[PDB]
């Protein structure tokens, strides 16, 4: 279907086909050399240049080499710099360039490539949709929003643009506004809309406005394979891990860690209170839009398996105690943090990002009334000096209606059924 050959390339199609045949047979090393020879002999040929880039691309996959892929990324750009490049080939080459740049984490580089594509093909709205994804990947929601507004102004029923626009509105706390876009976009069935992120946030937005249809969308997302269940809606998962909202210490196998937390709870409390009194700026307000109302702040000692050295200066005995337990300090998909919550606080029902962690809560200062946590269909409360354990990949919700502050210590651990190989290789979250 795509027209990849300009006038000159048509005359050398026999040589170009012979090289491409080598690539399709899996003789990648022979294919690279053959296209390199064609590039050497026909330095202006776009198809020869693209063949070289495709072979370098395949070779990077074979050898799992970032450096080989960087070479391919440059050759894809070289295609675009040649004279008389067919429009189909120009688009294919720069699109793959941007895709591979994103794979390498070159998000700024991918954005420049996508901006070039949009400038070269001003009527291609799918390219503008790709550009919006580029802005979203660097965290530039403002520019992403402008891009999808431009798309929706031309094609109002673009489902891909709708879900991404609705995602941005929802991230901006424009909850009611986001629902029709997320809903209509998912319902369009357009390529790219069947995504767990959009089912996740549509249901959450509906929950926040009191729309009872929220769980029909969790149920459909489960039926389409995005969620392990309607209750457990994490999106960064390892399949097969035991799934239950509440855990006992013995069920986790982390009984030595639990004993240490409970035996030594007062020193953990006292260091948290000292920071509250003398270094309160170390407690940072929750910043994921998870509160309906109230005050909730956290003082984080470990995140992504990395010790925060300045934070541990403020709780040195607690950090010294916890260093004996790699099951938590090495949990690169979890945190270790103090969590203070004040009266008048309601945390929206929400789910964590991954099923690969379990969460321990050690009670430190718990008012006698008013504080409770629901996980799935079960509500519990904290006790001073005692550990609660739940899987926060299940929907959970917290209220604080006491007459004074509530302080807990949160210790994330690797899910106990994850092998050591998985604990070393899983991407940090």
């Amino acid at each position: 279907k795509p027209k990849l050959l300009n006038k000159f390339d048509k005359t050398i199609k026999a040589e170009l086909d012979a090289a491409e045949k080598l690539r399709k047979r899996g003789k990648i090393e022979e294919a690279v050399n053959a296209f390199k020879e064609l590039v050497r002999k026909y330095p202006q040929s776009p198809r020869a240049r693209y063949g070289k880039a495709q072979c370098e691309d395949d070779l990077a996959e074979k050898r799992r080499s970032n450096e080989v892929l960087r070479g391919a990324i440059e050759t894809y750009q070289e295609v675009a710099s040649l004279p008389d490049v067919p429009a189909d080939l120009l688009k294919l080459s720069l699109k793959r360039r941007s895709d591979r740049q994103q794979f390498l984490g070159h998000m700024r580089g991918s954005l420049l490539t996508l901006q070039r594509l949009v400038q070269l093909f001003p009527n291609d709205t799918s390219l503008k949709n790709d550009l919006g994804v580029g802005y979203l990947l660097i965290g530039d929601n403002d520019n992403a929003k402008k891009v999808y507004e431009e798309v929706l102004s031309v094609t109002p029923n673009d489902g891909f643009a709708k879900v991404h626009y609705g995602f941005i509105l929802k991230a901006q706390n424009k909850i009611a506004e986001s629902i029709p876009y997320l809903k209509e976009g998912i319902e369009s069935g357009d390529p790219g809309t069947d995504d767990g992120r959009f089912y996740f946030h549509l249901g959450d937005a509906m929950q926040r406005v009191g729309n009872k249809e929220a769980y029909k969308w969790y149920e459909l997302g489960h039926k389409r394979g995005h969620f392990a269940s309607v209750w457990q809606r994490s999106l960064y998962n390892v399949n097969g891990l035991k799934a239950q909202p509440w855990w006992t210490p013995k069920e986790t196998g982390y009984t030595e860690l639990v004993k240490s937390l409970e035996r030594n709870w007062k020193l953990i409390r006292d260091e948290g209170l000292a920071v509250m009194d003398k270094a309160k700026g170390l407690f940072l307000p929750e910043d994921e839009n998870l509160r309906e109302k109230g005050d909730w702040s956290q003082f984080t000692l470990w995140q992504q398996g990395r010790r925060n050295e300045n934070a541990c200066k403020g709780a040195p005995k607690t950090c010294t105690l916890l260093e004996k337990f790699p099951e938590t300090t090495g949990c690169r998909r979890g945190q270790i943090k103090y969590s203070i919550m004040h009266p008048g606080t309601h945390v929206w029902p929400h789910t964590g990002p991954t099923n690969c962690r379990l969460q321990m809560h050690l009670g430190l200062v718990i008012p006698k009334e008013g504080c409770k946590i629901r996980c799935a269909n079960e509500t519990k409360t904290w006790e001073e000096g005692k550990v609660l354990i739940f899987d926060d990949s299940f929907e959970h919700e917290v209220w604080q209606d006491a007459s004074s502050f509530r302080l807990i210590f949160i210790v994330d651990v690797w899910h106990p059924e994850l092998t050591p190989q998985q604990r070393r290789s899983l991407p940090a979250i």
Binding site: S65, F103, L137
Partner: peptide, 18 residues
């Protein structure tokens, strides 16, 4: 940003190639 308690970012992991 980072996905700590929630799933609010477009992606929660960072891309580092192979």
């Amino acid at each position: 940003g980072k996905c700590k308690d929630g799933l609010g970012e477009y992606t929660c992991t960072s891309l580092e190639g192979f």
